[PDB]
Design a protein around this nucleic acid. Structure first.
Lengths: 58, 52, 185, 148, 49, 52
RNA sequence: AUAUUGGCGAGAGACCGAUAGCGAACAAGUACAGUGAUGGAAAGAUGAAAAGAACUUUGAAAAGAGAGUGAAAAAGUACGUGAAAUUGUUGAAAGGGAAGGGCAUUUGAUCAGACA
RNA sequence: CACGGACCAAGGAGUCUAACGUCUAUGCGAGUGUUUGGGUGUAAAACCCAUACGCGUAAUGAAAGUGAACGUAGGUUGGGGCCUCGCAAGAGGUGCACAAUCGACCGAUCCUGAUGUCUUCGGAUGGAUUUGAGUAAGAGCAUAGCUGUUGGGACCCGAAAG
């Protein structure tokens, strides 16, 4: 009583019903995986530049 | 001022007595609410029935 | 036959009109289907579709959030609009004057607003005061602060807080939630 | 109301919404949570992470009395005053007269610090406090009496 | 039978639980039996309250 | 006294009569007014000539 | 104070309405089956009232046929209404190894509406 | 040339409930739930109500335990709407919800370890490619309905057995 095991038929056709949606990619991507050493400094770069205007903006 | 409903005697014959509206009579009129509350409240006097 | 790039006879997925049977509700839906049509200003067209929103899509706008939007620059003279219910926030110990127009106020937020020399309005009087919407702020309450949305999209590594009856030790903290027993997530 | 159910729309259709191939039968996946390690595993993982196993110490004869410690943030803590008297204290806020708020009278076990009471000196009686809770109270001009 | 995303529910019906079901239909019929017996005893016991 | 009013309160503990979510129940009375018929644009013919 | 599918006596229902409701609306744990333990049905309805057909004739009788009773025997103790399968009689049409169906119109029978 | 069905009438199959998920309507709303009970009544209805209690408003660790603002409750990109200018087109001001993203805050784990002290207690401060079902101007509670699930005879009928 063997069965029919594998087939790819209909799978590409089911795939295009809702059809291969895109990244929906964003400005400002996630910093997951970025260099921790760069990322530490980047904290304080932004941390300082926000206060940079806090001296000008008042 | 309220509309001043007028008082009627038992022979007919209304009278110099005229009363304000209680302001329960100004409340919103909600036939969907009354319908939902009735349908539930009307179920509160009932008896069980079950086959043996 | 025709070869369609789309699915036929497919509705737009919107509220054309409320699902409520409320009578006084439909009198505003009747009032703003008229102004949305003939008044050419988008404010009326925004307030209309906000009368069709369900309850879960109508979170309440606390009387504190109303005070932020007034601190917002230039808006201290505007008439804030809330399609929804205004609720009380006593965590603010001062409140401005201004005006509010909403469907429903809670008894607390009615006092607080009246307490400061301000005024509570309905939507119908707003339509009469500013049909176009002159000098108004619409404000929405937070939608994703619900208890159910906290559970949406549960699955590995998504941090979505499983739906569960009882919270504490011994309920689904063990295998798969920590490295020591089995794995983590 | 059974006039609204969908099996009162399924009159006349053979299989009553349960499908003609898989039919509908008694218990296909076993009773209840059966097979939770075995054929339902993919379900338990994702939507019940942590189900199996043991975490920490047992506690014999536990009583939730010992553990009763309700918490009241400095967010509120002015709600405990009568709203008629309350605005008497906000205005004309000085020492030698300060509102005594017994937080145990209102059923609270600890005063936390979540944020920003006003500048009015207030006497707050509490069983427990937090390190930030008093700093904001004591800097407001009031004090915290401990009780039991 | 475990499916979808649902809280696990412990419901203890695996005994024979329909023998032991107690429905209270007399909640309002025992309230007058209880207000009687208090007015019975209010009179029996003399001005003793 | 039973349902209260603005002056006298309740006699029912923790209760006050409901509020209107619209001031006036006559919708066509609002739709005329002044300020609305001032902002309203001139109407069509209420049925459209079939063209073509 | 609590419990109660037994007992006695009571009041009730968005309950069932004789293939339902208790197994049992009736001479129902009855008739019947089994060595026994046990098993266990079917079965409501003339009319307001028997006023339940005197009397005549054919027939050995049952009944028939008239009269008679009744608001009605198109209610005759086979009895309220009396469906369907199925059947007898009459009338109509049809028929070359099935029958029955759809579209179309002729022919036969019928039907209003309408006009005026 | 697979299975059931001679025919007719009448019965005949996704129900109730306990506990919940989503969705919708309704009342109130940082609360909400009168009905275990008491008052009362035209009497199983309706009407009125004290105390608690349940969920919610605080999370986090096995636990002992501790417990949410550096700031207009922050910054940046985008955002309906409103306001200003302009004949308009459009630009500028403000920007709710919401999506992305970097910070600050509370708890747990590892690291540092202050003025101080019953000399080993205390834990200030400062961290970290760490971790949480968290904060960051509350939204839940109750009833009703659809659909779905679990336990129950469980949509109906059916075993060999014990």
């Amino acid at each position: 009583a063997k069965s029919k095991n594998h087939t790819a038929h209909n799978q590409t056709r089911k795939a295009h019903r809702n059809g291969i949606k895109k990244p929906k990619t964003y400005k400002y991507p996630s910093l997951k995986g970025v260099d921790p050493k760069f990322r530490r400094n980047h904290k304080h770069a932004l941390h300082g530049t926000a206060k940079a205007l806090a001296a000008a903006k008042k | 001022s309220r509309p001043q409903v007028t008082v009627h005697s038992l022979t007919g014959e209304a009278t110099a007595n005229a009363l304000p509206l209680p302001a329960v009579f100004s409340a919103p009129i909600r036939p969907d609410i009354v319908h939902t509350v009735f349908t539930s409240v009307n179920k509160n006097k009932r008896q069980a029935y079950a086959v043996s | 036959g025709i070869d369609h790039t789309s699915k036929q006879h497919k509705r737009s997925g919107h509220r054309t009109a409320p699902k409520s049977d409320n009578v006084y509700l439909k009198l505003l839906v009747k009032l703003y289907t008229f102004l949305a049509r003939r008044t050419d200003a988008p404010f009326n067209k925004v307030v209309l579709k906000a009368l069709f929103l369900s309850k879960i899509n109508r979170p309440p706008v606390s009387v504190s959030r109303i005070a932020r939007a007034l601190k917002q620059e230039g808006a201290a003279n505007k008439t804030v609009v809330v399609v929804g219910t205004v609720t009380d926030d006593a965590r603010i110990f001062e409140f401005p004057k201004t005006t509010v127009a909403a469907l429903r106020f809670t008894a607390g937020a009615r006092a607080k607003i009246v307490k400061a020399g301000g005024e509570c309005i309905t939507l119908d009087q707003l339509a009469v005061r500013a049909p176009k919407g002159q000098n108004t702020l619409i404000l929405r309450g937070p939608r994703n602060s619900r208890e159910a949305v906290r559970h949406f999209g549960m699955g590995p590594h998504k941090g979505k807080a499983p739906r569960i009856l009882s919270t504490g030790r011994k309920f689904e903290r063990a295998r798969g939630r920590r490295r020591s027993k089995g794995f983590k997530v | 109301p059974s006039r609204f159910t969908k099996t009162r729309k399924h009159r006349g259709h053979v299989s009553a919404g349960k499908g003609r191939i898989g039919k509908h039968r008694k218990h296909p996946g076993g009773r209840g949570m059966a097979g939770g390690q075995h054929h339902h595993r993919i379900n338990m993982d994702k939507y019940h992470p942590g189900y199996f196993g043991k975490v920490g110490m047992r506690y014999f004869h536990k009583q939730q009395a010992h553990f009763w410690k309700p918490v009241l943030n400095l967010d509120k803590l002015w709600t405990l005053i009568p709203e008629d008297k309350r605005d008497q204290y906000l205005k004309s806020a000085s020492k030698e007269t300060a509102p005594v708020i017994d937080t145990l009278a209102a059923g609270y076990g600890k005063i936390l610090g979540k944020g920003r009471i006003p500048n009015v000196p207030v006497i707050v009686k509490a069983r427990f406090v937090s390190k930030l809770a008093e700093e904001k109270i004591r800097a407001a001009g009031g004090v915290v009496e401990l009780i039991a | 039978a475990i499916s979808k995303n649902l809280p696990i529910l412990k419901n203890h019906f695996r005994k024979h639980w329909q023998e032991r079901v107690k429905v209270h239909f007399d909640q309002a019929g025992k309230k007058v039996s209880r207000r009687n017996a208090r007015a019975t005893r209010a009179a029996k016991i003399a001005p003793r309250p | 006294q039973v349902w209260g009013s603005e002056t006298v309160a309740s006699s029912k503990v923790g209760y006050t009569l409901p509020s209107h979510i619209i001031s006036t129940s006559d919708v066509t009375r609002i739709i005329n007014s002044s300020e609305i018929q001032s902002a309203i644009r001139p109407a069509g013919q209420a049925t459209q000539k079939r063209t073509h």
